[PDB]
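Worked example 4.2. Below are the chains of a multi-component assembly; read each line carefully before continuing.
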Amino acid sequence: LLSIFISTWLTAAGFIHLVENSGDPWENFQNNQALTYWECVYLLMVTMSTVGYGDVYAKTTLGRLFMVFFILGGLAMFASYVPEIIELIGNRKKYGGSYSAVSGRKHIVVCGHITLESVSNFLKDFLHKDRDDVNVEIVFLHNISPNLELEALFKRHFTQVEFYQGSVLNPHDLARVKIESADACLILANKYCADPDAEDASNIMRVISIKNYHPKIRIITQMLQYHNKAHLLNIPSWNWKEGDDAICLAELKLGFIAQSCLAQGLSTMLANLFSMRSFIKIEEDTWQKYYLEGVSNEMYTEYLSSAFVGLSFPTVCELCFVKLKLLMIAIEYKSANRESRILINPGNHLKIQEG
Amino acid sequence: RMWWAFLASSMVTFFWMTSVKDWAGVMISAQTLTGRVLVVLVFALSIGALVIYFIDSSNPIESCQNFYKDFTLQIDMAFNVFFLLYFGLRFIAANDKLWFWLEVNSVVDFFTVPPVFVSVYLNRSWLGLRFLRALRLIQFSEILQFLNILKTSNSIKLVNLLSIFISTWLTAAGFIHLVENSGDPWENFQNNQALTYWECVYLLMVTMSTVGYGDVYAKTTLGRLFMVFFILGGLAMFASYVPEIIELIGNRKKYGGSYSAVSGRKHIVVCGHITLES
Amino acid sequence: MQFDDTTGVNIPIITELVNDTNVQFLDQDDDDDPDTELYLTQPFACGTAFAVSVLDSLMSATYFNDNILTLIRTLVTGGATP
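Applying the procedure described above to all three chains together yields the following structure tokens:
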């Protein structure tokens, strides 16, 4: 294209230069014009950009005739030869590239099914106003390009969210999101599907791929059944103790209802105990005024003091309640015989072990 | 005429440390409140220096400038000192020591400050490549985020497009203004043309809109050459950088908005399945 | 799976695969790189993974010699006589 452009431009400039140097035969060459070739190239570049200064212009009628024919030939070259070829050099890729590894930004890679509904709640309760020290840049990676609603959603969180297009099976795509160094990778899953063993085994495949790339990453995934979660203990690189954990939607979603059948309303407590929710100060004596005084309470894990060692569990609960106003729901008992097993409200017979 | 004493010097100029290279490394990124103020104060003084060049256009290209004179000239030199002490720390603080040798933020400073720091020893002034400092206006959208006005990234892309438009337009206008003020070397500078900078900006705005009056036009052959290259560079900027980005600011929503509650118009809301037949 | 009288990792298996860039998942042992030639891949070399796509190479090898295919067809099928 550049060669045919420059060749046509220089050829027509040379032709009109030759015409304008000589005069006119019917005027017996009495109407010449003195034009250097560089000024003539200036003329036929000003012309084909439709600027048209007029500092240098054709003065021979035979030259004006060639200019009339040549602007039509230039448009016929422009409307029929280039304008589809220009559009072939106009398909810029929307979501490509890689991640820029800014230091101090442990980029969480989130993959698996990604939709406005699934991502929005997660983004609302993850990138919340009441977090402490969030310097963490979420990197979504998914092969289907998003619709316009996700464009509007990602534009809202501009400083923390980057989307990328591609699978998590091609290890080149994992090399683009810098999966090798990341605090953890979270694989989401659809709430609904035609077959739960489709997306269950697909997420197991994604866990296999991500641990095959870098075997020292924490993966927090989702499952849709309970009988498909045993395939995660299949992988030798998957260590639950190391902190790689799988959240089963069916077990938790339809376990909360089961515990609620015992205690009417436990789901509200165990959902407000873990969502980072904003306290709104209500002055008026409503039920909300008494409700929002427990929403701002959350769950923490903590090692115990040495002074509590050897005592009984209700004694330490009594001290932690009256003295420090902290409720100890459960403790971890670790023995050589068995893997440490969380015990909730352990009986007085059980005593505290050191550390 | 020692115009080449500045330009050739500019061309030849173009031709335990691991803990002090990262002392300002936190100040490069937008991590502290202190790292903001460095880019803000190199940008505001770049604006101030650009103003001097705009005032300098009236002045003759080559002149004698001493130390005890008009204070604009005296504070211009302190601006240049602050500039060199600003971008001098990033020679060792740059991770890549290869692409700093051709960085657009570095070539813009190779050509302005070394003519000044040679001209101090000469006690003169030539209207050198001081128009180039508007190329730092691409860092405008960097510092307008920090004042918490640009938060929607569509506004940030709009500010980026307007900034690169105005910066390219003013830079090319300054370049062709410098070319048309002087004459031609092969004609021994006998073919000058007297152009104010505002008329020159008028010229290169009439040009890139493909209007082309011709009340003001290039008369130097070296100027006409730059106009030929610059209209192709403007179309190459127009056909390959903007025309997809313009279309990103062209998706207007068909059926949005709300209802205007005109009094006396009890508006029946009809919802549910809606089709031409029903 | 585990058994007593051992560990199920010693069990000889062949699975059929449908992708070239999918064979590295079969092999628990670490490999030098994710981007490994299929021939160089540990599972293929051991012979515990038959990719279906390498048969697509035989159409090349049948092109350049008329007798490769009848050789494989009589070596493998066990006398596939017409």
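Take a moment to check your reading of the output against the notes. Chains B and C do not touch (no CB pair under 8 Å). The longest helix of chain B spans residues 153-181.
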